[PDB]
Amino acid sequence: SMRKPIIGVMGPGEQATPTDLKNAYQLGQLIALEGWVLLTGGRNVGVMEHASQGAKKAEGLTIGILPSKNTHNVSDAVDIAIVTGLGNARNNINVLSSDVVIACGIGLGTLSEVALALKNQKPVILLNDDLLSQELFANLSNNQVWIASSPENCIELIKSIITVKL
Amino acid sequence: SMRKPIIGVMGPGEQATPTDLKNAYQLGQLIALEGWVLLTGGRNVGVMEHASQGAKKAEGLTIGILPSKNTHNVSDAVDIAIVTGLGNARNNINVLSSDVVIACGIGLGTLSEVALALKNQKPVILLNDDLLSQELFANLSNNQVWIASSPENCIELIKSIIT
Amino acid sequence: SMRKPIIGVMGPGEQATPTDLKNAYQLGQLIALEGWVLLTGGRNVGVMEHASQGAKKAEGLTIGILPSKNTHNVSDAVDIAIVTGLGNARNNINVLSSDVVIACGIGLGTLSEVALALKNQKPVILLNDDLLSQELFANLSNNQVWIASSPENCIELIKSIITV
Amino acid sequence: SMRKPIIGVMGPGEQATPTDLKNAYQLGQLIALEGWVLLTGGRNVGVMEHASQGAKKAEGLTIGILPSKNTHNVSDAVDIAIVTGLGNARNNINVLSSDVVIACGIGLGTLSEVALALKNQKPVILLNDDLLSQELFANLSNNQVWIASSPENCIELIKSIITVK
Ligand SMILES: [Cl-]
Ligand SMILES: [Cl-]
Ligand SMILES: [Cl-]
Ligand SMILES: [Cl-]
Ligand SMILES: [Cl-]
Ligand SMILES: [Cl-]
Ligand SMILES: [Cl-]
Ligand SMILES: [Cl-]
Ligand SMILES: [Cl-]
Ligand SMILES: [Cl-]
């Protein structure tokens, strides 16, 4: 493949913590500064939107995988709107399309995406303060999930992951 | 609606524990005995297979929602094979189609289905031996998830929910 | 497989003509009288509604594959409501799930299902008065599609197909 | 929306004719020269492959919407590989995601996409030499479908559509 790495950033919306939102915005910037593509589920609030705005601040390309049948809710920070009409079934597209999936914070939708990514043997990085989810996913994935300490650490982990792929 | 209640029994496939299989068979029997319809992921392994066999022993109707593009892997105990060709994206159809979701055991696919069902505000009953999953879903659902003690207790809970 | 044959009856919804509705009801009834399961797109309009009503008149089992995320539009004659939340992507589930697909009338959604059925290597029977779609699908399918003259003829064709 | 127009080029894969492939390549180039994004079904065959290669020759961005669960079959000329695992259900994503759908040749998957696009009242342009398909879609769309004469005429039609829609 000559394609740029695609990094999926998943996380909560309205219930994202202040730390999740700061982490998301920083991640978006850092992904774009590497020349990587950012993929999100296209939500116009919370982690996905802060990540997308971060990437755009650093002139990166952003892809949104929308659950709706139209673009009515997509933000200006999404360059490419993939309109699925699949509702929450689109979560599987997010994970299959990503070279690495980062869960920035935790919530029900994020839990579903992490679970699907690990079932598909996709590399997953958790960036959150939820020890229960970390232990549960480590157990179910036979310790294949990665736990990051910061946005910068996520980028370091991605570089090690995509180097082993190569 | 004059339709019969559809109870979705989710749970591990190949990695199901022996207790998950015994619980799944008993759930299938008891669901069928109520005249309810059983929905599973449809394959010839694990909770899907055992629940479907339990329901068939009691002459219940069984629906399988298959992830592949044909019926190669279908349980012999599935009456209606819905072939989706969606892979793991069929998990959402399982949840949306169920009046109640029971998670019998734990694994990655089941975690995805429970999360989706709770996000849809579907009633969800956990029947497992995994205290981490029970505490995590109680927290994320603001204690709306039910934790069952047995297959019989799942049935009792469903009767309270659907009445 | 010990499962009953599943016959997918596709056709227009809101745009169905009175002829399509009569044909649909008769098809549903005959599918059920054969001891087969009827699958439709499940909604309370058009061929879906009338085929389902016909199958229920003969006490057959009916499956509806709904495009929305709830049962609000389901036919009262659907026994099993499979709620997909997929929109028109559910058309692929309709054809993958069917042993034979019947197109009862014509419209854009029905054309998409016929095309997907033929691409997914499923037997298709056309029961309509649309010569252009009949010729086009005969050409694209190297004459594997079947053209029926009546609801009874559809059942005759199914019996020949599911025998081999 | 400040997003670039996304033009979906649909058409036969394995069964594409030499004319379909020439038209597809030229379409891809012309879409990219307008600064538009090309969307295809993403695979390394037929119209998908040749449209993607034409767009890359003109340094355009290409999106591929793949039906399988990995990138095994992806065209080398796809920049963004959307892996769906949906099989032919991805055809709905192709049409929902496109501002205009061009059907470059005819085959069964293409017919499904044309039909779904028209059902959604998405603009559709047919570029083919099949008068049966042109008459059928004109009838079923109440003459809303467009019939193009050449790849260049497709671009002219897209400009007329983007202006009114
Ligand atoms: Cl979430
Ligand atoms: Cl499964
Ligand atoms: Cl399967
Ligand atoms: Cl599981
Ligand atoms: Cl419909
Ligand atoms: Cl519906
Ligand atoms: Cl139709
Ligand atoms: Cl394809
Ligand atoms: Cl593919
Ligand atoms: Cl085609």
Residue numbers in the entry:
A (entry chain DDD): 0 to 165
B (entry chain CCC): 0 to 162
C (entry chain AAA): 0 to 163
D (entry chain BBB): 0 to 164
The authors write:
The green alga Chlamydomonas reinhardtii harbors a Moco carrier protein (MCP) that binds and protects Moco but is devoid of enzymatic function. Moco carrier proteins (MCPs) neither belong to the Moco-biosynthesis pathway nor qualify as Mo-enzymes as they are non-enzymatic proteins within molybdenum metabolism. In the present work, we identified and characterized the first confirmed Moco carrier protein originating from a prokaryotic organism, the cyanobacterium R. orientalis. We showed that RoMCP selectively binds Moco and discriminates it from its dinucleotide derivatives.
We chose the MCP homolog from the organism R. orientalis, a cyanobacterium belonging to the genus Rippkaea, a recently established phylogenetic lineage formerly assigned to the genus Cyanothece. This putative MCP, referred to in the following as RoMCP, consists of 163 amino acids corresponding to a molecular weight of 17.1 kDa and shares 52.5% sequence identity with CrMCP. A monomer of the RoMCP construct in the crystal structure comprises 178 amino acids, 15 of which correspond to affinity and cloning tags. The electron density allowed the modeling of all amino acids of RoMCP in an uninterrupted polypeptide chain. In contrast, most amino acids of the affinity and cloning tags show disorder. An RoMCP monomer contains five α-helices (h1, h2, h4, h5 and h6) and one mixed helix (h3) that begins in a 310 conformation and ends in an α conformation. The helices lie below (h1, h2 and h6) and above (h3, h4 and h5) a parallel β-sheet, resulting in a three-layered sandwich structure that resembles a Rossmann fold. In contrast to the canonical, six-stranded Rossmann fold, a seventh strand (denominated β4) expands the β-sheet of RoMCP, resulting in an arrangement with the order β4β3β2β1β5β6β7. A nonregular stretch of amino acids between β1 and h1 contains the Rossmann consensus sequence GxGxxA/G that is usually involved in nucleotide binding. However, CrMCP exhibits a tetrameric quaternary structure with 222 point-group symmetry generated from the content of the asymmetric unit by a twofold crystallographic rotation axis. This tetrameric assembly is identical to the content of the asymmetric unit in the RoMCP structure. PISA estimated the solvation free-energy gain upon the formation of dimer AB to be 90.0 kJ mol−1, which is significantly greater than that for the formation of dimer AC (55.6 kJ mol−1), indicating that the formation of the RoMCP tetramer follows the route via a dimer AB intermediate. We thus reason that the positively charged crevice and the chloride anions bound within it mark the putative Moco-binding site of RoMCP.
